[PDB]
């Protein structure tokens, strides 16, 4: 039955399996300031926006669409979607991953509400004649917020 050598060493009493010594002293080394959940978010903030934008950009898309409830597909499965495809040769032939965003997961209604304020800002900018530029979105702010806890983690340690 045993598969883990490390588990075995503990039950028996034997010394640890050896590994090559590492030159660096970690007394001094750079701090780590990145966040695991971030991946889902950058993937999600864009995802929510992309679906919202499709409805927002197109009147036909907007018609017959409810912000609170929408379905990307009736039978879509995120696990099923994960894939790697090299068929496209437009720039070059190489793998192309597919990631499925659960429609349920996306906070579409909140995004639509945010977009309106943003498009109104865009419209005033159009009146200004200067292209509208938005420095940050709440979703972008959150990225820093989830991220923030990590800086403290490294530090505490």
């Amino acid at each position: 039955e045993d598969t883990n050598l490390d588990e075995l060493r503990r039950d028996c009493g034997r010394q640890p399996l050896p590994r090559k010594d590492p030159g660096v002293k970690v007394e001094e080394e750079p701090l780590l300031s990145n966040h695991p959940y971030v991946d889902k978010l950058w993937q999600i903030h864009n995802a929510e926006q992309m679906i919202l934008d499709d409805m927002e950009a197109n009147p036909v898309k907007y018609k017959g669409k409810n912000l609170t409830e929408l379905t990307d597909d009736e039978d879509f499965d995120e696990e099923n979607r994960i894939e790697y495809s090299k068929a496209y040769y437009k720039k070059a032939l190489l793998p192309k991953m597919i990631t499925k965003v659960s429609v349920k997961e996306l906070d579409l209604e909140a995004a639509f509400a945010e977009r309106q304020h943003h498009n109104k800002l865009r419209m005033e900018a159009q009146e200004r004649g200067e292209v509208y530029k938005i420095p940050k979105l709440r979703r972008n702010i959150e990225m820093d917020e989830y991220d923030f806890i990590h800086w403290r983690r490294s530090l505490e340690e």
């Binding site: 080394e29 750079p30 701090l31 300031s33 820093d144 923030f148 800086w151």
Partner: peptide, 11 residues
């Protein structure tokens, strides 16, 4: 004094 890496504190 933080002495290394990302020593500075954001926010």
């Amino acid at each position: 004094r933080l002495n290394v890496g990302n020593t500075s504190n954001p926010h």
